[PDB]
Every structure is written in C-alpha cells, then in structure tokens.
Amino acid sequence: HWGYGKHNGPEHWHKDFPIAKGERQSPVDIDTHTAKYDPSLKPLSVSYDQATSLRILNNGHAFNVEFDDSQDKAVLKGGPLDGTYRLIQFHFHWGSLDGQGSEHTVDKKKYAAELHLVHWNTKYGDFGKAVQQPDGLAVLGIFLKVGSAKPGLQKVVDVLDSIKTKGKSADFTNFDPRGLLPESLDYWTYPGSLTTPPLLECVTWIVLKEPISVSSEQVLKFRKLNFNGEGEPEELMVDNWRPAQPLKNRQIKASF
Template identity: 50%
Template sequence: MQYYPYLVPVVILIVGPATWVEKFPEARGTRQSPVDIVTSRASSGGSAPPLVWRYSVNHPRSVVNPGYCWRVDENGYDSELRGGPLGSDVYKLQQWHCHWGSVNGEGSEHTVDGRAFSGELHLVHWNTSKYNSFTEAAGQPDGLAVLGVLLMVGSKHDELDKVVRLLPYIQHKGDKVTFSEPLNPANLLPKRIAYWTYPGSLTTPPCTESVTWILFKEPVQVSAEQVRLNLCYYVNGKNV
C-alpha cells in the first residue's frame, strides 16, 4: 500500500538521559533520541515520496520478555518498508515493542509540545539494501528505520489486544509464547498517515545514532483496561 505524508518536518530539540554518556560515548552525539516535537518549529517536507510498507500476516510469531519490555520478533520475514525519508532502500521489520510508563499518560518516549502519551509503539526495521544483518545495520547511520506510534486512552485496540492477552504468560525474563492467531503489524498503524521524521538514535544504550525516525502524528487509541494491564506488567518489576 502507498501513503503520502501530509507533513514531514525536521525536529531539532534533543533530550535524553545525561548519565548514559559516561559508559556510552555515542550518547554525546548530535542526533540523540527521543526528542520533544515542537510543532511550531517543524518545517514542511513538501512533496516527499510515498511511504510504502508490506507485512506478512500468517507466519509464526512469538512474544518474548527480554527483561525490559515485551517484544514481538519478526526477523524480517516477508516484509518491506521504503519511500518517504528512506528513499529507494528497502527495510525489513525485525521486531516491534512498546514503551509504557508507571503512570497512565506518561509512558511515551517522544513528546509533542511537551505532552507525553500513555505509551509508544516502535516497529523496528533494518536496511537490507546496504547491510547483511540487523546487527551490522544497527551500527550504521542509515541502518535502522523505526515507525513510532503514540498511544492514548480511548477505544479498545483489537490487534494490540492479541499481545495484551498473553502478558500474564511472559512475566519473567526469557518467557516466550507463540501466537495462536494471525497478526497484522499494519493494523497497529494509524489511519491518517501524516508523520514527523528526523535522523536520530536508539533510545536506550548503546544509544547508537543509526535510526531514521518516522513518528506518526495521529495517536492510536487503546482502552483503559489495556493500559492498566501493561502498567501492571511493568510495575510488577519484571521490566524497566
């Protein structure tokens, strides 16, 4: 499917934990993430090329607890992301995960005009046109592309609920459960495909500056119960 962005701004305000620089020198870099998106300072990208993606629905997937979040591994299986700020390079989906806070409404990594959201979903892709593996790509300036989706309380999200229902079974680091039903990553994205984009970094150590961020402007709704279950998953101390 092809989508044309309504706005492709460049964001220049940089934020992030200052304490990481002692052990991870790249955290001193000039393109650290996450950022606060100041909409009054965002510039239009003009006639940017369409952003194109394709994801497999029926291949086997598992949700795993790596010790700091929940994560769904895709490993590049039959997927494609290109266009927009990525040009003609083809990126494949490696994994997707979600960030939640200990307080409802304060879980997103990126903020918009200083406002945080309940959570933030990240679909992590790597550049298969230039690099031979995810590990190699993760160390290169154009190696990764992350689709960021802001989450806010509203209606229940059916696709995300397929993950939420399995959280009780992955409470400990290393726990892993295979999905028993098809799952379509495209259904995690908002209907209105307008986005901000900027060259950034991994948001956690080693803070490598290898990410082209594509953050959708329209938040996706999740139910209060889905937020509560995710918060319980984090507050229980199994994740950071």
C-alpha cells in the same frame, strides 16, 4: 546493568554508553510549529500483509514481538527512506500513569505509550550490520492514548501473562501488525538513534502524527509485567521510556 531506575536509568547511561551525549540522540520533542513541511518527501509505504511473527519476549526492558526477517515480507519504504527496510520487531514504551510513557513528545505533550516498529535496511544484509550504519534502521513510532480499545492489540495483551518476568518468551505466530496502525500515515521524520543502550546513531525516525487509542484495561495489562526475573523481588515494568534529548543540529521534517 542499565535500566530505568534511579541508579541505572537514563541519566546514568552515558557512563557505559558515551554516545548518550551524542549529536543525534533520540527521542526528541517534536515542536510542531518549527517542523518544516517537505514536499520532497514521497508517501510512506507500509507493506505488512505478509508479516510472519515468531515469538514474544520479555527482555527485562520491554516486551518484544519478533518477526521472521529472512525474506522481504513486512517492509517499510518511501517517505524519507532510500530502499527497503525490513520489519524485525516491535515493542512499546509506557508509563506508570496515563500522562506519561511516550519517548517522543509533541509540543512537550507526553502520550501514555509509544509503539516502535523496528526495521533494518536490507542493503546491509542483517540487523547487526545495519545498526553500525547511519542509515541502518527505520523506526516507525506510533503514539498511544487511552480511550477506546484497539482490537488489534488484544492478542498481544492476552499473552502478556505468559511472559511476566525477564527472560520469559512465548510462541507468538500469525499476529498482524496492520492492526496497530492509525488511519493516517502523516508523519514527522528526523535522524536519530536507538532510545536504549547501545544508543547507536543509526535510525531514521518516522513518527506518526495520529495516535492510536487503547483502553485503560489494555495499558493496565502492560503495567503488570515485571522488569525482574522469576523468583526475584517484584519491580513492575513501568516508565521504561527515555526522556527527550537535545535536538542539536537537526531539523524535523513533516510530511503534511
């Protein structure tokens, strides 16, 4: 029954998921003066023009836009990555207030939200196998700040009323995730983990330096979602972020 509450939130996860205290947990604080520029890094390749979204789901923890990953349609390559990683889903983490909500922090700065575009290494054939491998996943993380609206997010916002509560889903076809990306693909990268249970240490993190701007209205609609099931006492889906974890034996590399 893990969650983000006082009795089941991040500080409790290690009891069911002891890897929570592991050597390469995420998220982390990105200390920008200590991150090392790596000329080894090759440019990141985000090829999302053939993405096929399927559905959107409230899973009690966040909302998730799921894609058809049965062919090489939307993929991430280059950067720190070897090979091809297929987009399977994206989701967000966000706050109760504009001053918190991201998982990663930048020089301890918290953003209003963070977008995770989740990809799996096609060398492992499926996502479930990939999560058992140290190089199984690549998650592209993109910060959200509140300011101007992001037009490409609006189709997501407008379907949230149909998936208010835990377990609700809806058709969500022809959504183009390119509309969620900032101009710059300058990034930080480090080896880490899933930021929710099971907290598996399978992720190459790629966190973009440039945030996207979303409007207050757009994020306010995120905060009207519910963690609870239909006909249960309302618990607003807010502050579904894990705090920064110890960096331990890792170096964050910068592409710029």
